[PDB]
Nucleic acid binder design. Sequence first.
DNA 1: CCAGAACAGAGTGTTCTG
DNA 2: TCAGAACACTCTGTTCTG
Lengths: 74, 73
Amino acid sequence: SKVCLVCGDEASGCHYGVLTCGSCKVFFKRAVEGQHNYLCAGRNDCIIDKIRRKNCPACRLRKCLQAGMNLGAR
Amino acid sequence: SKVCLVCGDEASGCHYGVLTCGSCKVFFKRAVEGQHNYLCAGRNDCIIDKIRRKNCPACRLRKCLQAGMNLGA
DNA sequence: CCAGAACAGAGTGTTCTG
DNA sequence: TCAGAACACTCTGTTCTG
Ligand SMILES: [Zn+2]
Ligand SMILES: [Zn+2]
Ligand SMILES: [Zn+2]
Ligand SMILES: [Zn+2]
């Protein structure tokens, strides 16, 4: 059974280039195209799992990017 | 004017014993009375300010309590 | 002035569709 | 196969009332 490379939850398939859960899929699209105040309250090392993924959108987006998510050819 | 001792925002008065903004007032009553599953994603030192106070309710609650907030006062 | 109620929003996560 | 739309919810924050 397949696991999200970002938050560890159960993954539906490959989204924006990366094996991810549905919530990480849509969070990534929204973060890149949106305007948000995202600032880590930590050390930019926050644990991102299902229970805590809402805690630090800044670390979550970082994980999306470092995993290689992208919206396609520029 | 005066600053919230929890998140640093603009303080609306003395709530539950501590100089506090309005958001932190109701966050605290909800946190102490209800049931949540707050879990720190960090090292339990998270920065609590207006920009980030939503990030870590657990660190926020610890900070409210360390400041001396209580539903009795 | 302050506590609690009432009211409203941000951000999130799911179901549905082709 | 995966991307997008759009509703429903959770926690949150502000205005209102006593
Ligand atoms: Zn995920
Ligand atoms: Zn973080
Ligand atoms: Zn505050
Ligand atoms: Zn924390």
